[PDB]
């Protein structure tokens, strides 16, 4: 007996929707769900989505708060849709999908996973709930997390941080690394190896390792002296560049960090959803260097320095695929003389 | 157990709210509320209310379907609010009255009559409905309408029409004319000696009377010959000038009536609610003759009639009040050596 | 004191505004001015403009309510603005004009026509109004009318009719017929020889003269024989052609009046407008017989054959320019063996 | 003569409304109201309320810019409605009641708190307004606050702090802690010895004790120690549980500023108003520990430490209840073998 | 072949329009421009303005990204229009200036301005841009930036800060620092001797001389002893007055900036735009003392103790003009036996 009032008694109540009997008087203008609370509205939930206010409301309220991958994961593994839950993704205040399964009666594409609706879709099931392991198995396509194994699944160990109600974070109470399969055209697919994002914030960016920890308290020419980054032009892809107008370089997070802390910039957000890399308009506002799309990836320091060692430094210019996050990011690598000009990821 | 999508459903099912069992998919955007139907969205409802769009919607299907008091009776009554029930005023596209008692939590100020809010409010009942007669007895104000005798008090009878699902009718198969009980303060009053306004249309006007038959039918010189009105300037007042810019007299509904068989004409509803004069932006289509503000008021010939020939002809200008609809019409009267110049409703 | 409270009190109180002292109170939902009325929200206005909803609702409120050329002459004279006035368009339900002159803070440019801001535009100027023929007389650009003779100016007579709200009439009660007057650039200019369009309605069309009279009352080969139009593919061009998936010809308004009284058809104006030609999208509802653009103008019977029969019929197709409501019109001749194919304001 | 020009034209000028003469272009659209500078539009207003845009401008203009009463306190005290002024929520942006008494035409009930439509209701009055404690004498219902004595009147003391434009604060260039009067049917009501929350921020949290000092300063082994609170379960109750996937206790403000020094975690405040005890759902980021849930009140730490140790902890389960606020707070006390197990403000 | 779906390409791809050749999907719901990414709508832009949404995206879109001056600067030299480009008022969110020339096919007045419609207007031009230079030779009235000197052209120096994205900032990588020029009725005009306001934040205030370092670590009357301020008021006008209910002085950003380094206040800025004086109600949280319009000026400490030590000390009260930012700023001077009491930008 689903209804709008009970999911606003829900959320009221519960704070969120937990299946509990009840309702509340709820007022819908324009894009805002409030409710009355001694005598005057009290706004519950602003709809930033492209979907009815009352629909969206419902989905939010019907969110998995339990620990989920983060969403730029599912996107990269080509989630569709979630079995019977909602993947509520934060950066656009939004469903992270379309449609839902046995959630809410104006977005359901079926009540269950295994109706034929379903079967063409990378459909994401959790572990956790009882009987999804088992969905997974006859799924023709889908994505499964576990905190466990299954019994002759190759598993896949994903990230060590999960969001929590739009927290990243690296759980201690709960458990956030989960273990990943993939299903294509009825098949289990083997992930490929691959390193991970940090998810880390510019504003309360902490470091991973001890290169991390030189990165941001050494100057410059000593931390490339004490790793021997000579040739691998650090000074250009991580420190950053701000002698001209175009900001030169400035692609890791930890460069930014560093940055951030003796002086501000303005990173605009111009695509503004969850991604392995993100692309930014930067302008720095000590100089006045600016770049209009500044691709930035928040490796761990030493995976960056590792991928870069790594790599032929004999032509003048080649793309170079790491998996990252379970997707093929292409970075373009410029050299010179045997030694490294630029290194970054390769604008689409 | 109230909610959107039983209100959908009940409208959906029973082509109103029934008290039915059963929920059906809603999305709401903007103003209107839709439902899901094989796939698609069917438009249920568009809010042309000043109230949050879903608890329009639920006055609206909770609106009373059988015939009630045209919303022009209850207003010059004083009716502040309906007792159990949503009188809709179709002329406006709204509910009648603010707020209801035991009818949608979000407009409720009480769920009976009897609560102390109440006793200041005339709070309109339906003595159709079991118990209402003898909650009027209790009440302090309040609005009676009974289709028989009330034990011990006298009754007023109202109009012979009353308002069905926004069709102003004379009933045949139902019962359209009600006593009218009114007490003020615990005090039953006598309500005063009214005429009645006839609420015609101008598309489809049926005389109701052969001084009416007679109207529609002959010329002008030989109608005012008929029935004696030489010196009552209905040449002005009923039948209307269009020989000068500014468009002479045409203040009753029958003048109007006779012209727009000939010709038709704009009229301007600038204040679009139901009232017992009526004020209209008038612009003669076959002429160019014009008034901004032409009040027009629809009352059976005869009775208007009565109303002039009832009237001191020897002062230059008056003002003459009639009790129409239970309320003062003042009503402004020019008159030049005996003989009446115009006669107009000054109300608005 | 220009307020909204003060517009509002105006419309309520004068039907337009009048510059009556006064307030009502006023709400704003949306597009929507409503006013409070014993307790309830009734509708004033409602905003199809792209203005913001309190500045359309002045300049409605504004308009001029005096017979004034319809919009399609205006547009054809080259109008800007107008003075002091709001020249309303009813096809569009919008100001004519963007900007006014001494009517809106919001819209106005400036408070009289002699400021240099006005000088390049072509400002409207109606004779009707004290010291207006004077400010045209001034104005570097202008179109005048008046009701009489303008010393030393040469009259262009108008269009017999005009627009009173919203009405095209040709007055009886009022003056619909103006004298045309132009100033490009402090030089009067010399409106050319021109036909007019007679702004008449499908529904409600009469006749204009003999012609016209015999072509609805005569069936189609009788008329083209007492009128002598072998040879003019008046079957095609104005009777009509509902024999083939595409209509053909049907580009005259009496035309498709003749047909509307036999049959139904659907015009879609799919840019609703006042122009001197007009296209519609038609489906005549009898034969399936459709056209994306079927080009119409409403031609007196009598002008249109002047017109075609003025022509060179000896070449296969051609541009023919006639002025028609001071604009000039291409039409599409097609001929064939020295009789007329089709003819067609290719116009939009 | 109020408008929405004059009420724009006292923003621009005064900083809000000040019954000043003068009026400023404006335009509305959706719900935002503008003003022209300099040919360009400046946003004035943003409504959040579900009232009509240009109703709601004139209420947060019309705004009480003294220290009022925070609107729990209000809430608290069961106020309805103010006299002559508006308290605008500024938790809510919108105004603290649905009504006014003498303050703008579309809201008010009545223009002086004398008539008879506000004896029901309990009527804000302020004694710094000449007239009001008079007119509360007067008043059927009402609430009173005064910078002093009123003869006769037994006092109240209230809160130190009151909020000044939305700045809740303890004046020292302006009077914040007033007598508070209430009056219930006629009658003066005594109201309840209480305790008061302190109305601080987690962000900006002081400490206003030695107690609440030594709680931020020291370990909590050691405070619990200083303070003789062994049995009381401060470790759970105040310092919070972060060790399962279910946050523990952290229902008193310092605790979650203590918290907050450390590391971060997410509030969502899914009812945003004002009140005594606060409901958040909570997610710390450090553990990944989180609570649907989790009640929170701001008391002095040694009105809390008071009220835990006034306790009879010889039974398993049993509601405490407390006056914070001039209300009644139920909390949930659970003991075990003479100790405390859990003190919570009782989730209704 | 300009498009939504070009533009929108633009930003997705390039950061900002960039003549680049693509289309991608594109979803307009309310005032939100989407676009579609692996199958979920993302934001692109959030329209602010008062023009439709699709129009408001593409001037954002087509915003200048090279460092122009600052809206207040163009403002005060009554520029009305930019040829070829977008000046974005991120203060405003909205275009700087109401129509364009050359840049969107909706907003566009002319596409050159060379066009007569644009020889009224003050048309900024940039000499960054080839050929601007002398179109503001050929152009009636404009606002001229060059980098450089132009032969015969009598340079004015401007600020030291230009607007990079909405980032103020003093350019090193980059040139902010212009030569201005204005042209008035076709005739250069000599631009006055001016000071510059600095377009410092009070979050990231920074101290621009040795007098403001001082100001801001020395005690209020050793600063004033060192700097020899005795009898200028310094303690009312820069340092503030907290100690009635009405906020004393304060109109220099300095002296907010050293206040909000010991205690928070709130600064409602009420007409949100750039301008050289802004207008503030500010209320102070520590004390309480707040005051409805507290202009405030931020000019460097040594800029603001020259004008007041150059002012004659011997009347009552009197308008000094200083110009600022080429404008004429009016400050009130007040002085009583030969010492100022107070000196602030005055309230018009
Ligand atoms: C594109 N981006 C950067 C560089 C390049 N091409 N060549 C050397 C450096
Ligand atoms: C106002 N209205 C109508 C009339 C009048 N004044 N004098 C004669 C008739
Ligand atoms: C286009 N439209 C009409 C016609 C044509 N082409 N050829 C003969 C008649
Ligand atoms: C509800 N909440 C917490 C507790 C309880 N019941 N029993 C002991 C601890
Ligand atoms: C206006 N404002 C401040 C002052 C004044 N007038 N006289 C002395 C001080």
Same mark, same amino acid.
């Given at each position: 007996?689903?209804?709008?009032? %009970?999911?606003?008694? %829900?959320?009221?109540? /519960?704070?969120?929707?937990?299946?509990?009997?009840?309702?509340?008087?709820?007022?819908?203008?324009?894009?805002?769900?409030?409710?009355?609370?001694?005598?005057?509205?009290?706004?519950?939930?602003?709809?930033?989505?492209?979907?009815?206010?009352?629909?969206?409301?419902? @989905?939010?309220? /019907?969110? %998995?708060?339990?620990?989920?991958?983060?969403?730029? &994961?599912?996107?990269?593994?080509?989630? !569709?849709?979630? +079995?019977?839950?909602?993947?509520?993704?934060? /950066?656009?205040?939004?469903?992270?999908?379309?449609?839902?399964?046995?959630? =809410?009666?104006?977005?359901?594409? +079926?009540?269950?996973?295994?109706?034929? &609706? =379903?079967?063409?879709?990378?459909?994401?099931?959790?572990?956790?709930?009882?009987?999804?392991?088992?969905?997974?198995? %006859? +799924?023709?396509?889908?994505?499964?997390?576990?905190?466990?194994?299954?019994?002759?699944? #190759?598993?896949?160990?994903?990230?060590? #941080? +999960?969001?929590?109600?739009?927290?990243?974070?690296?759980?201690?109470?709960?458990?956030? #690394?989960?273990?990943?399969?993939?299903?294509? !055209?009825?098949?289990?697919?083997? @992930?490929?190896?691959?390193?991970?994002? #940090?998810?880390?914030?510019?504003?309360?960016?902490?470091?991973?390792?001890?290169?991390?920890?030189?990165?941001?308290?050494?100057?410059?020419?000593?931390?490339?002296?004490?790793?021997?980054?000579?040739?691998?032009?650090?000074?250009?892809?991580?420190?950053?560049?701000?002698?001209?107008?175009?900001?030169?370089?400035?692609?890791?997070?930890?460069?930014?960090?560093?940055?951030?802390?003796?002086?501000?910039?303005?990173?605009?957000?111009?695509?503004?959803?969850?991604?392995?890399?993100?692309?930014?308009?930067?302008?720095?506002?000590?100089?006045?260097?600016?770049?209009?799309? =500044?691709?930035?990836? !928040?490796?761990?320091?030493?995976?960056?320095?590792?991928? &870069?060692?790594?790599?032929?430094?004999?032509?003048?210019?080649?793309?170079?695929?790491?998996?990252?996050?379970?997707?093929?990011?292409?970075?373009?690598?410029? =050299?010179? !003389?045997?030694?490294?000009?630029?290194?970054?990821?390769? @604008?689409?």
């Amino acid at each position: 007996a689903m209804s709008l009032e %009970n999911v606003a008694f %829900n959320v009221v109540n /519960k704070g969120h929707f937990d299946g509990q009997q009840g309702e509340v008087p709820v007022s819908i203008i324009n894009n805002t769900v409030y409710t009355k609370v001694d005598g005057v509205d009290v706004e519950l939930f602003e709809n930033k989505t492209t979907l009815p206010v009352n629909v969206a409301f419902e @989905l939010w309220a /019907k969110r %998995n708060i339990k620990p989920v991958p983060e969403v730029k &994961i599912l996107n990269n593994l080509g989630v !569709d849709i979630a +079995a019977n839950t909602v993947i509520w993704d934060y /950066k656009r205040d939004a469903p992270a999908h379309i449609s839902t399964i046995g959630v =809410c009666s104006m977005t359901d594409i +079926a009540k269950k996973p295994t109706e034929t &609706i =379903c079967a063409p879709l990378t459909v994401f099931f959790d572990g956790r709930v009882d009987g999804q392991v088992d969905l997974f198995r %006859n +799924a023709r396509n889908g994505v499964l997390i576990t905190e466990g194994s299954v019994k002759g699944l #190759q598993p896949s160990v994903g990230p060590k #941080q +999960a969001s929590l109600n739009g927290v990243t974070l690296i759980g201690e109470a709960v458990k956030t #690394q989960f273990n990943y399969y993939k299903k294509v !055209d009825g098949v289990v697919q083997q @992930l490929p190896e691959t390193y991970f994002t #940090q998810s880390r914030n510019l504003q309360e960016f902490k470091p991973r390792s001890q290169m991390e920890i030189d990165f941001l308290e050494l100057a410059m020419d000593e931390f490339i002296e004490r790793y021997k980054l000579e040739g691998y032009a650090f000074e250009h892809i991580v420190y950053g560049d701000f002698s001209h107008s175009q900001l030169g370089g400035l692609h890791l997070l930890i460069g930014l960090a560093k940055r951030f802390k003796e002086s501000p910039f303005e990173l605009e957000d111009f695509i503004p959803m969850d991604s392995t890399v993100k692309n930014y308009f930067i302008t720095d506002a000590q100089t006045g260097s600016s770049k209009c799309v =500044c691709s930035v990836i !928040d490796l761990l320091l030493d995976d960056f320095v590792e991928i &870069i060692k790594s790599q032929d430094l004999s032509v003048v210019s080649k793309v170079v695929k790491v998996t990252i996050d379970y997707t093929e990011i292409s970075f373009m690598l410029w =050299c010179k !003389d045997g030694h490294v000009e630029t290194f970054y990821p390769k @604008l689409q």
